[PDB]
Structure formats: structure tokens, C-alpha cells
């Protein structure tokens, strides 16, 4: 039915980046908080702004959402791409996820110019980032958006079609924003 | 197909509650952002902490899901409660977001004995409260949960059967969470 992509929120940044810090007060019988994270932090999803342009409206209210497909890095050499709205990477970094090697492991695409020649509108890895500045840049410049930190779930998803939706926390004008990611399953 | 029933994310707490501040920063050719944002800002679901009890699991992995109905709170007197695991109330107070007027707006809802007898799992509504810390707690007290702020949208959805999505900042143990609706029309 639905599987969730999402990795828990911990205090997990990169490092060099803030680190979360959750407030609790109790106020006349309420619990309430306070959140401070980074827009980087956990599963999240990069706008180009992230890279110093413009964000655009790819997306209708920001909502992720189409046919999914995964594909596994190592599996894929030299083949189509999947017909997809939303292409999921399923790199096995997420096994070292909480774990401090976890930001030195960086994926390598060879792909990623076929990528950027098909109609994906959004490329979700269960990995740190999907490469460097250019990288990025070379995605975000060609209006798809990336979806960073996904689930060791993935895995499961490796071959199949779903349909995948992902909601951020509805900011717009922001580099990034932390994001739920599912898959709805036939 | 999908409706967002969220409102975007500003610097419109409730009197008394912490500021939205998103702070950016440029470092080598990235543009990065620290969010700062009480757990009760905008669209929000409360959970039992919010009230001094104990969080359970009534939703697997924390996401709100099921068949969705939305009543009309003048309409809706001395009637049968739909069939449903998601209750929405709309109010017509979301007329007033953004504006200070809002949150005097405090819903009157004669029916809360009706919804605690009944198998539904949330109440959402477009409007701040449901009502007083005695309102929350006999929901929250019967492992019922509660989305506040919806947007306007809830009009189009009276009388209307849909299935909800809400998918909230995936955060265990906390009093309230950042939630993103959606309702999908068949």
C-alpha cells in the first residue's frame, strides 16, 4: 500500500551544517516546542535556488508527485531510463545511515547526461547528495529538482513502478526544504 | 485529483508563540537556510504530548491516511457523523488567515460527543482550535488527533467523500508537528 521513503528527523547534519534543536516548554498545562534545523537536514528536497538561481513552479503547490521508478546504481549501466515523473537512485549508502561515514560516501551517476535529456522532472538517492556543485547545478539549471537522504526502502523499490509523492514543508522562495517522501504501491 | 489543503508557511503564529525566522546564508557558492518555527505555526497536527499525555502509533509510520469527509459546521445539527477516518470541519474561519481576526475565531462544535463515540482518527479543521485545552485533551485523551489551520479548500470538499493524505515532519516523541494535507477526489 504505502511505503514510507523518509528517514526519521535526528539530529544528523552534514557536518558544517546546523544541527537540530528541538525546545520543549510547558505553558499553563500545554507541551509545546520550538524547531530549529538547517533546510538541509535529513530527507529534503533541493529547489535551484539552492545553487544561486531562480525557483520555478515545476510542480502544482510545490506537491512532488507522478509515476516512479528505481533503478540501482550498480545494476544500471547502459540502459534506457525508465518512463518516469520521479527516478529514484537506490545507491545502498542508506545502510549507513546515523552513521558518520555515511557523508563520506558520494554516489557516481555516469548517467546523468541521459537524465538530463528525458522528461524526469525529480531525482530522489538514498545517498548524501548526488555529486558536487556541478552536479547539482546540472540538475537544478535543467529544472529537476533533487531529493536527498531517502530511505533504505528504496531498495524495495528497485524494478517496480509506484507512484510517488513527496511534501515539503510548503515554503516557497528556500533553497531547500525537509520533505516526506512515499510510494503508493500496486 | 490533488487538492492541498495546507496553508503556506509565514510568520503568522498565534499570539504569544515563537516567531518563523529563516535565516540564508551564502557559503561557496551555495545558498543555505536555518529554519526557526514553533511546532504550533500554520498547518499542524497536535498530538497527545501537547496536552501532557502519552504519543502512541494510530497511524502507521505516523501518516495520517483514509477515507476523508468534510462537514459544513452551520449545516451539520442534529446529524449521523459520516463514515470516515478523517473528519473535516469547515468553518469559514479561513476566510480570515493572515489577519489577526483569526485567531478570536474559536470554533463552537456541538457534535465532539458524537466524534469520540465514533472510529474516526483525526478531526482537521480551517481554523486555529477546535476549542480549549478541555476540547483538545478529550480528543487527544481518545487516541483522536487534531489538524488545525486548513486552508479555505475544505469549502470544495463539503459533502464530498475523498481520501486524505497528511504527511508531517516525520518526528516521533514532540507535541505537535508541521503537517502537509492533501485530499485526493475520486
Chains 1, 2 share one sequence.
Not at 544561486?52 to 521508478?69: A, Q, S, T, V
Not at 540502459?79 to 527516478?87: E, F, M, V
Not at 552513521?99 to 530522489?124: A, H, M, Q, T, W
Amino acid at each position: 500500500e504505502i511505503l514510507d521513503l523518509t528517514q526519521t528527523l535526528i539530529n544528523f547534519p552534514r557536518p558544517g551544517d546546523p544541527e537540530l534543536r528541538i525546545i520543549e516548554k510547558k505553558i499553563d498545562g500545554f507541551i509545546v516546542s520550538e524547531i530549529i534545523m538547517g533546510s538541509h537536514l535529513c530527507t529534503h528536497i533541493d529547489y535551484p535556488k539552492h545553487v544561486g538561481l531562480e525557483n520555478r513552479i515545476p510542480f502544482k503547490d510545490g506537491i512532488i508527485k507522478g509515476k516512479g521508478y528505481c533503478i540501482s546504481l550498480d545494476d544500471f549501466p547502459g540502459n534506457k531510463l525508465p518512463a518516469c515523473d520521479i527516478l529514484l537512485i537506490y545507491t545502498g549508502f542508506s545502510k549507513y545511515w546515523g552513521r558518520d561515514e555515511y557523508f563520506e560516501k558520494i554516489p557516481e551517476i555516469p548517467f546523468l547526461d541521459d537524465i538530463i535529456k528525458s522528461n524526469i522532472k525529480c531525482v530522489g538517492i538514498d545517498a548524501c547528495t548526488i555529486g558536487g556543485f556541478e552536479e547539482h547545478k546540472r540538475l537544478l539549471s535543467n529544472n529537476i529538482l533533487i531529493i536527498e537522504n531517502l530511505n533504505e526502502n528504496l531498495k524495495n523499490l528497485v524494478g517496480k513502478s509506484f507512484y510517488f509523492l513527496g511534501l515539503p514543508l510548503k515554503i516557497f522562495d528556500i533553497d531547500a526544504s525537509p520533505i516526506r517522501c512515499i510510494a503508493i504501491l500496486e
